[PDB]
Amino acid sequence: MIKLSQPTIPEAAIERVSEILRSGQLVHGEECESFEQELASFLGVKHALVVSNGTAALHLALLALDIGVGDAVIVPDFTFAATANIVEMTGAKAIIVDVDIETYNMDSELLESCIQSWSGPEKLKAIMPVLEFGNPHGLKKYREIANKYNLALIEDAACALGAKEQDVMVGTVGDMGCFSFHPRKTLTTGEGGALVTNNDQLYEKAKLLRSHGMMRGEFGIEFRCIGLNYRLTNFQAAIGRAILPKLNGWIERRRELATIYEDALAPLEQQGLIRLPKIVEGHSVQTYMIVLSDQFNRTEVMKALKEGGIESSLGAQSMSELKLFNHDSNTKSNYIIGPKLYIYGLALPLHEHLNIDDVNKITETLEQILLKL
Amino acid sequence: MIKLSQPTIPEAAIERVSEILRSGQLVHGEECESFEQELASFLGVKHALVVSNGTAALHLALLALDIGVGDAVIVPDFTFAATANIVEMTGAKAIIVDVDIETYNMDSELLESCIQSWSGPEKLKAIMPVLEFGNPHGLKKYREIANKYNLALIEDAACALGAKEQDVMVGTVGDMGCFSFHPRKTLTTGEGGALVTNNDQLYEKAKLLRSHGMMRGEFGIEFRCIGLNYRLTNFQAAIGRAILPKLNGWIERRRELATIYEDALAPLEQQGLIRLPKIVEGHSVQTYMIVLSDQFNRTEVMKALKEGGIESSLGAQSMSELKLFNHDSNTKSNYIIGPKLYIYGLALPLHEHLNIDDVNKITETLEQILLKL
Ligand SMILES: O=S(=O)(O)CCN1CCCN(CCS(=O)(=O)O)CC1
Ligand SMILES: O=S(=O)(O)CCN1CCCN(CCS(=O)(=O)O)CC1
Ligand SMILES: Cc1ncc(COP(=O)(O)O)c(CN)c1O
Ligand SMILES: Cc1ncc(COP(=O)(O)O)c(CN)c1O
Ligand SMILES: [Cl-]
Numbered sequence A, B: 001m002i003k004l005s006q007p008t009i010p011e012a013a014i015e016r017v018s019e020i021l022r023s024g025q026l027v028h029g030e031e032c033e034s035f036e037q038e039l040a041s042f043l044g045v046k047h048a049l050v051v052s053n054g055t056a057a058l059h060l061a062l063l064a065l066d067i068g069v070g071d072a073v074i075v076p077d078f079t080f081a082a083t084a085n086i087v088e089m090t091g092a093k094a095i096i097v098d099v100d101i102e103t104y105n106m107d108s109e110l111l112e113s114c115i116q117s118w119s120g121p122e123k124l125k126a127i128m129p130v131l132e133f134g135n136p137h138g139l140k141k142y143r144e145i146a147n148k149y150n151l152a153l154i155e156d157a158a159c160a161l162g163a164k165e166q167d168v169m170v171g172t173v174g175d176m177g178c179f180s181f182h183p184r185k186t187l188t189t190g191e192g193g194a195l196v197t198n199n200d201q202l203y204e205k206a207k208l209l210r211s212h213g214m215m216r217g218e219f220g221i222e223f224r225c226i227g228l229n230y231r232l233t234n235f236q237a238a239i240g241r242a243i244l245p246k247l248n249g250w251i252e253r254r255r256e257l258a259t260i261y262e263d264a265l266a267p268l269e270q271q272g273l274i275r276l277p278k279i280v281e282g283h284s285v286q287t288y289m290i291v292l293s294d295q296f297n298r299t300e301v302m303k304a305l306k307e308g309g310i311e312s313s314l315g316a317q318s319m320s321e322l323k324l325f326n327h328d329s330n331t332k333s334n335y336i337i338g339p340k341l342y343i344y345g346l347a348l349p350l351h352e353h354l355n356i357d358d359v360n361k362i363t364e365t366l367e368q369i370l371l372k373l
């Protein structure tokens, strides 16, 4: 069976976890610290904090900006539910904006238009666009728009560690940026994430919030404010540190497999049967998602791929369709693209241990399903 | 150097983590499921959920009971800050009650008296007593009091997995009970925790909240409500599963070391120089904390123990002294015991790899410091 994801943990990391478990510095230590330094260096960004998961990064980003009851944040319609959920868990309201059919990312024009017509009652405080599947496209526009309207930008870069927006690493443009190390992502620590920022107060506040408001004072550990526990373990950090220096190379290989998909599938796209993703420069290809034409039933397609030894899945959800984010501004809007991607979007296997023969088999099987051969 | 804590990870668990990392079922799986079943069986309780840490268990317990803005929860003055912090992170207010000089646990009489004189404005919804250091004493009284006043009981059993209140396992008396698997605790998963309950709706709600409101529906995974990510990894769960069948035995050995401390130190207690903890039946001895007399400076004692090759620390904090929990009801109360334990309480090494000679060395060194020999 060709699998969607096969997490790759280097043997050196496995040995290192063993050493840690046996010695027994388990809690956040020199491994987390070093992982943060290496993440910061990788990204070109002043600060990193590793945390329990990608949702925690988002959560701390909201909390550090003091976003909560009375406030509003704009989220894309197409994403994993965490993006909108985590906004509402603070008390704020998730205001949904549709995404663009080509990028699968928040539509910058709908975004600006949503801001201009905003009528409260809550105060709009941030934009939380998703760089979906590792796609950076739109990011500079989101920044430009956020500044024009005096809003914070929080990058939900869950899927985009290693993606690059022209000259600038994804995650480093927002006031803060957030990454997931969930096993479906390309660097995984099983569960894990990171919150990054160029802002010292946001960093220091998130860091207090991450660990019970603890910081170092003259006579020892001080408790300066209320907080949570969103710490990552030292052995998880070690896992991540071993993957990070391989990550760019892994991404390069993924872009090469995407080239293979694109050329093999281009005729099906020509015939109007599928829409292929635009893998722009700096796309990290965390996911390769096509869109099935209208005529097809994704459930049947997936079944027939599975019978041919190929895994597939939906790409992401439609937040409007979940019916959980019920600000009047959402119920009075109309969403077109996100709901379509939710039903017709089909992720195909693309990871570190697929080769050209695997992709040829996948595309031939797709062909035979769609064209009936 | 004799150490306060030396986390014990069995070699079988280490190998199992390796297998998991290499195979790569990383996210919550059959290991978490099984760990929950074994925890439930160990405790005699209907439901367990493993979670990222002990603070997360507490958090989910609050959220599952719908505790937040407008609400109040009673917490002990002597505990780790998470207990009070996590109440306030929901929007509720932490109402502090002093603890008892012998048990280090919430004073049941001050508790009841705090309820009787409560004057809002918030609605009092719960009691969150701490079974501090693994001490069960008071637990049935907390239940009795909670029922009399129609309040939920949430056990902060962070430190008390394996402790027993007469016939009944700690954690199984509250509407919910919460455990930490932090490395200072006797079973550790590096970071980890569990939320347990005999109530099906609280279990089902916490479980939705733990993972983005996900549950199983006829055509697949459904998103039924907003939630968080508080999942534990499959490999962490494996660690915990390997420790749990050893835990009772580990506790028995700890009670035996406590016997040794008690007899070696009893003269110092006789002379009024220290107060020894009362290790009642069912105390899991997560921590052995003495209280220094007035005359002594704990900082100097700790320094001199360290120079004699012995680690020590404070036991816990005073919530009133942190000045973070500022409901009028707290600022107009007076706390006696918690503030004293905060300054005079001294934890001494007691874990799986200390022997009688280690304890004899510790108590002789203490003796020579206090009596100046
Ligand atoms: O697609 S296959 O599974 O048939 C072969 C994939 N190869 C296996 C060898 C590791 N890696 C080299 C990169 S690194 O050493 O991990 O940085 C390239 C990916
Ligand atoms: O105190 S010492 O470090 O000198 C010796 C401690 N022993 C080491 C042997 C493991 N265990 C047996 C219990 S179990 O097999 O882990 O369940 C008892 C604790
Ligand atoms: C866009 C997006 N945002 C947020 C998250 C949440 O990250 P985590 O799973 O690490 O909690 C995910 C997880 N797949 C995601 O894809
Ligand atoms: C009484 C108490 N409550 C809550 C916690 C929080 O648990 P965790 O460290 O697993 O987040 C601790 C941690 N030592 C604790 O001792
Ligand atoms: Cl190849």
Ligand SMILES: [Cl-]
Pocket: B354, B355, B356, B357
């Ligand atoms: Cl011995």
Ligand SMILES: [Mg+2]
Pocket: A021, A022, A023, A024, B007, B008, B009
């Ligand atoms: Mg060991």
Ligand SMILES: [Mg+2]
Pocket: A007, A008, A009, B021, B022, B023, B024
């Ligand atoms: Mg492997």
